[PDB]
Amino acid sequence: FQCGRQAGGARCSNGLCCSQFGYCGSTPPYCGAGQCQSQC
Structure with a gap:
């Protein structure tokens, strides 16, 4: 985990999901x- 509230507020590779x-x-x-919440 890196993104969302599971970590705090970040993103993985690029503007994916x-x-x-x-x-x-x-x-x-x-x-x-x-x-997938944002994109699938």
């Missing part, structure tokens, strides 16, 4: 199929 808890990604179960 950030999971409900605070898990940002662009390919794992955060951006594709998992817990």
